[PDB]
């Protein structure tokens, strides 16, 4: 049981560190540029219609 838990903990810490290290930044960095592009695309059609 000690040899099983010592083998399982190294996989669990590497999986949690890999997923927690790889999770947030691509979705946040893509979502910020998508929100800015949606804001500029929403602003240009109002600027042309106002012009």
Partner 1 sequence: NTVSGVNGPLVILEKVKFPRYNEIVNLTLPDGTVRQGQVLEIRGDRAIVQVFEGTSGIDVKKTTVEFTGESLRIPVSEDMLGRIFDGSGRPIDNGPKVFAEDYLDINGSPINPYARIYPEEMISTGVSAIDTMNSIARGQKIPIFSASGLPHNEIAAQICRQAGLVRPTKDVHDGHEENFSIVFAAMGVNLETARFFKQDFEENGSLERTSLFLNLANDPTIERIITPRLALTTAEYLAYQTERHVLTILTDMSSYADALREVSAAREEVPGRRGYPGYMYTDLSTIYERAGRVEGRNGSITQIPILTMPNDDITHPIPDLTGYITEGQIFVDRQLHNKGIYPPINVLPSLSRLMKSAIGEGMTRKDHGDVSNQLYAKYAIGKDAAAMKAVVGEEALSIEDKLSLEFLEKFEKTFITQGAYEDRTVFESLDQAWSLLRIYPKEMLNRISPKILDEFY
Partner 2 sequence: YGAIYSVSGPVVIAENMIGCAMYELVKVGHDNLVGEVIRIDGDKATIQVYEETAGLTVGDPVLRTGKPLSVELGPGLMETIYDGIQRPLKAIKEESQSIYIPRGIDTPALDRTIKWQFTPGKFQVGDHISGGDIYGSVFENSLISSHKILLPPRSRGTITWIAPAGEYTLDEKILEVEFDGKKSDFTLYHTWPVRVPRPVTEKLSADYPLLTGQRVLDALFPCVQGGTTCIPGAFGCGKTVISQSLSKYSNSDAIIYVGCGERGNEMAEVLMEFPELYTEMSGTKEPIMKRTTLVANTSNMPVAAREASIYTGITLAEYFRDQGKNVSMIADSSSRWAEALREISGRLGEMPADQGFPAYLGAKLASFYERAGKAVALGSPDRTGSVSIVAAVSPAGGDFSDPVTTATLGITQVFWGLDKKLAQRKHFPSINTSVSYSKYTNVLNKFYDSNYPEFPVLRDRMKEILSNAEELEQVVQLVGKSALSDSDKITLDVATLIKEDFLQQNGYSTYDAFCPIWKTFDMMRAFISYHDEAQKAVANGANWSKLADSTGDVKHAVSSSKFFEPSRGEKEVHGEFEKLLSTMQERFAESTD
Residues within the interface to partner 1 (CB under 8 A):
10, 14, 17-18, 21-22, 29, 32-33, 36-37, 39-40, 43-44, 47-48, 51
Of 5-24, which residues contact partner 2 (CB under 8 A)? 11, 13-15, 18-19, 22
| CA 36 to each of CA 11, 45, 47: distance values in angstroms, whole numbers, following the listed order | 39, 15, 16
The least CB distance from residue 4 to partner 2, in Å, is: 15
Query: Among 8, 9, 12, 36, which residue interacts with partner 2 (rule: CB under 8 A)?
Result: 36
């Amino acid at each position: 049981a000690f040899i099983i838990l010592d083998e399982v903990i190294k996989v669990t810490n590497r999986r949690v560190n890999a997923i927690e290290h790889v999770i947030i930044p691509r979705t946040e960095n893509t979502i910020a540029y998508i929100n800015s592009e949606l804001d500029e695309l929403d602003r240009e059609e109002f600027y042309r219609l106002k012009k």
